[PDB]
Chain A
Amino acid sequence: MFMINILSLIIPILLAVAFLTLVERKVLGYMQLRKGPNVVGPYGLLQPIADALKLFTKEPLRPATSSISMFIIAPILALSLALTMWVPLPMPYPLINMNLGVLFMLAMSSLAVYSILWSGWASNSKYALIGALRAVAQTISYEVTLAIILLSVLLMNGSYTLSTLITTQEHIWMIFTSWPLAMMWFISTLAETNRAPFDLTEGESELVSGFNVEYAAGPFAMFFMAEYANIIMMNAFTAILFLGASHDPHTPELYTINFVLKTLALTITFLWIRASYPRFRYDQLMHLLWKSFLPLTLALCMWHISLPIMTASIPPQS
């Protein structure tokens, strides 16, 4: 019966990712004065299915100069970790209830980079290596700031339990308390998910395909699914963190609908941003994160440590 719950979490996530791709194409098209997919199915509703069936019936290629074990392990690790990040999210009840769910997401997101690193290295081609090294620089840029931002925000929660965040925001959204932290958190999520204007690893105009340039068919499809599931997952995490829906224990579906609407709004904002800005330079991303976000984040961390003691606002939990 817990297996049924695992499947009821996994399969709908994959369906949402498949249709997220259709949504991105349609939103970008209408923002570019065109229509996007509207032939394959009514309103392009069958386009993701055609894409998936096409990618899983095409020839997967193993490069001659590549290391096979890492080459094959990396997409598996990417997709499995993308699916694993969803299990502690309370919607309003989590599949897995963790004391330190935030730390769990931090650690698994840190482990997810090695899929790109090992993929790029094991492809044994120059563009894949350049993409992998860009991933190294990107993680170095965003990780410290993202962790300190999370700590500063959760000083209002009293713990790292994700369900407590619902109780914390019972009367007001936490974005009214820490919008300067929310802005930097949103930009750091853009960097962490390798999304434009921070999509350095793929580097399409610049590096052709970046890290997965040598990937074809099903393995490439798995990388794509992992990336889009990560987009949805990070936006759901932000929605839980900063825009807390009210939860009625006798009618949890109201919370579920509200939370899903907020997650969709944030994902559509991601797609909106991709159609508006040019790409960063990756050293410029490092300098943005280390010379602007880091000092402000340190100062705001001190402020959010002092404020509950200043005003006698310390949250309950031990």
Chain B
Amino acid sequence: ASKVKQDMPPPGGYGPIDYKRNLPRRGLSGYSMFAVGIGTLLFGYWSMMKWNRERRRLQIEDFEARIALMP
């Protein structure tokens, strides 16, 4: 006298299944991104200004060596 055994859902019910779109925001603000970009640009401009002025002085020294040697 065996009872009916059959593939059925468990008692009560199966756990809820997610189906809605899940796309998080995941970012900074536009103002912050622009501000970081301009800050990086200004730091680069200042560094390049110093280095190019030093390069100009070094080139002047190199040219003076040639002027001394030319005669």
Contacts and interface: CB of A to CB of B under 8 A. Distances in A.
Given A156-B48, A171-B47, A172-B48, A312 B40 contact: no
A179 interface: yes
B45 A177 contact: yes
> Interface of chain A, helix or strand or loop or mixed?
loop
A156 B48 CA distance: 8
Nearest to A167: B55
A73 interface: no
B41 A313 contact: no
A315 B51 CA distance: 9
Contacts of B58: 316
Contacts of A206: none
Contact of A172 (B44, B53, B59): B44
A311 B45 contact: yes
Interface residues of A, number: 22
Interface string A140-170: 0000000000000000101000000001101
Given A314-B56, A316-B56, A316-B58, A177 B51 contact: no
A208 interface: no
A179 B59 contact: no
Contacts of A311: 45, 49
Contact of B55 (A172, A177, A307, A316): A316
Nearest to B60: A316
Interface residues of B, number: 16
Contacts of B40: 176, 179
A252 interface: no
A314 B45 contact: no
Interface in A260-318: 307-308, 311-317
Specify which of B37, B45, B53, B56 lies most central, judged by the most chain A CB atoms within 10 Å of its CB: B45
A128 B59 CA distance: 54
9 contacts: A167-B55, A168-B51, A176-B44, A177-B48, A311-B49, A313-B45, A313-B49, A315-B56, A316-B59
Interface of A: 156, 158, 167-168, 170-172, 174, 176-180, 307-308, 311-317
Interface of B: 37, 40-41, 43-45, 47-49, 51-53, 55-56, 58-59
Rank and list the top 5 A-B pairs by shortest CB-CB distance, nearest first. Answer: A177-B44, A176-B44, A316-B59, A313-B49, A172-B47
